[PDB]
């Protein structure tokens, strides 16, 4: 109960939104026979709606004055209270994949640059080396840290094109 947001399990507007969605979904149910395939699809949609409302509740999620769940972004506050699953763990979850793509792109760029006419390698990809680097990029932050200390990651600006101001 932070920032004046009630939990989703004990919110009246959350349940009123659930009842409203169940009402409109059951409105379309009266136009089809129960043994039809649109009825089965509508029943599966209603089951997915009920499962989503149940799983969104009782998970630490909270909402305020709207019936729509809110996300807590401050670290520590999302760690002392059970809210790290909203954005805190997705932050490291995205950064792992984001650093994965950046690392395999860097290794492919470095590997292709030590080859005759490297401009062709960007439009003519090679599969075995790219796929080998794709499956050799799980430890991207471990390769990134070791290259940072020793200068292989970076480059001094004496061989870097700089503006003539």
């Amino acid at each position: 109960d932070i920032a004046g947001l009630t939990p989703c399990s004990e919110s009246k507007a959350y349940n009123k939104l659930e009842r409203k969605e169940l009402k409109v979904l059951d409105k379309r149910l009266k136009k089809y026979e129960p043994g039809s395939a649109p009825y089965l699809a509508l029943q599966a949609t209603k089951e997915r709606t009920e499962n989503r409302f149940k799983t969104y509740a009782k998970q630490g999620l909270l909402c305020g004055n709207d019936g729509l769940p809110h996300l807590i972004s401050d670290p520590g506050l999302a760690l002392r209270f059970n809210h790290a699953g909203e954005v805190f763990i997705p932050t490291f979850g995205f950064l792992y994949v984001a650093g994965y793509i950046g690392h395999v792109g860097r290794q492919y760029i470095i590997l292709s640059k030590e080859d005759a006419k490297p401009t062709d390698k960007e439009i003519i990809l090679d599969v075995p080396l790219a796929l080998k680097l794709a499956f050799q990029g799980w430890a991207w932050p471990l390769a990134s840290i070791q290259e940072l200390r020793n200068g292989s990651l970076l480059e001094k600006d004496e061989n870097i094109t700089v503006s003539p101001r």
Binding site: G102, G105, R106, I109, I110, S112, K113, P118, T119, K121, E122, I123, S152, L153, L154, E155, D157, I160, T161, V162, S163
Partner: peptide
């Protein structure tokens, strides 16, 4: 694009193209 090229040149992800 030249400034972005400098940024990619600083940490050696410069494309061959």
């Amino acid at each position: 694009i030249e400034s972005i090229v400098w940024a990619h040149n600083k940490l050696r992800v410069a494309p061959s193209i």
